[PDB]
Design a protein around this ligand. Structure first.
Ligand SMILES: C[C@]12CC[C@@H]3c4ccc(O)cc4CC[C@H]3[C@@H]1CC[C@@H]2O
Ligand SMILES: O=[S@]1OC[C@@H]2[C@H](CO1)[C@]1(Cl)C(Cl)=C(Cl)[C@@]2(Cl)C1(Cl)Cl
Length: 272
């Protein structure tokens, strides 16, 4: 019951996703691993301990390495996983940039708006991709040979990013709905620096219309009543989480630099 432009739209997005989402993380390589003013620190300590994960690496030979992080004892140990996480986020950002560049609607925008939109949405599309490898039964992001497992329950869901992943996983979305969510986030007309506000706004509306129609054509079950509105509410929450985590990043970076060059570029850090 989709129009022809709507089916072409979904096919282009799925094509871009298929070409640029390394779902086995097979090409994530050469990453770092953990080794073998007072008010600023207290806030950063709170920022860092709100997510605690252990790390598992399954080798191509059947061997397994497992890393359990240190407890916060008031020193530099709270930073032990930052170089690794920076490498992982950098790898994901590259895939997200590649995703956007393949989409015709994005390619046709002026280069300055392309940059503004990626700066605005890269984090959000990364999280949307991460949700598809989230195992809500085990609290684990399954990234091919790497796993990130939440350290232990109802208390963990107080953390907005974690509540987001659990609530979104429960909607049991299709691949097509995830990639439409990515497009709606990417084409947000109100990111800092966008110039072609009206063009971007019209594109976003068409992706939202396509998503609403996809759900109506393919999900008649009473469990999916209001599904379109639930997804849109999650996207608004994701934007909120993005703003929160951007500020966390800049606070951590202020007293303990760790952002890679690509992260600096996307977050506006000039190197001076
Ligand atoms: C998620 C945290 C804030 C956001 C940080 C971030 C934010 C953006 C990004 O590209 C990478 C990282 C790595 C470390 C993250 C932090 C580790 C714990 C903290 O809450
Ligand atoms: O791309 S970044 O690096 C990955 C980290 C975060 C996302 O930012 C979270 Cl929210 C997710 Cl998702 C994963 Cl996976 C981890 Cl491991 C945690 Cl910290 Cl769990």
């Amino acid at each position: 019951g989709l129009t022809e432009e709507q089916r072409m739209m979904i096919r282009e997005l799925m094509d871009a996703q298929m070409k640029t989402f390394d779902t086995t993380f097979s090409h994530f390589k050469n990453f770092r691993l953990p080794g073998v003013e007072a008010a600023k620190w207290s806030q950063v300590r709170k920022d860092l301990c709100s997510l605690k994960v252990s790390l598992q690496l399954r080798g191509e030979d059947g061997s397994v390495w497992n890393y359990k992080p240190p407890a916060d004892s008031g020193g530099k140990e709270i930073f032990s996983l930052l170089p690794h996480m920076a490498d992982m986020s950098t790898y994901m950002f590259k895939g997200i940039i590649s995703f956007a560049k393949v989409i015709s609607y994005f390619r046709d925008l002026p280069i300055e708006d392309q940059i503004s939109l990626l700066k605005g949405a890269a984090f959000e599309l990364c999280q949307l991709r991460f949700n598809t490898v989230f195992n809500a039964e085990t609290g684990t992001w399954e990234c091919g040979r790497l796993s990130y497992c939440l350290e232990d329950f109802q208390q963990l869901l107080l953390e907005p990013m974690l509540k987001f992943h659990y609530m979104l996983k429960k909607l049991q979305l299709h691949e097509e709905e995830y990639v439409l969510m990515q497009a709606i986030s990417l084409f947000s007309p109100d990111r800092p620096g966008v110039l072609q506000h009206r063009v971007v706004d019209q594109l976003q509306e068409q992706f939202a219309i396509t998503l609403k129609s996809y759900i109506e054509c393919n999900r008649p079950q009473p469990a999916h009543r209001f599904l379109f509105l639930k997804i849109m509410a999650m996207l608004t929450e994701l934007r909120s989480i993005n703003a929160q985590h951007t500020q966390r990043l800049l606070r951590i970076q202020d007293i303990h630099p760790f952002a890679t060059p690509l992260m600096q570029e996307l977050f506006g850090i000039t190197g001076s």
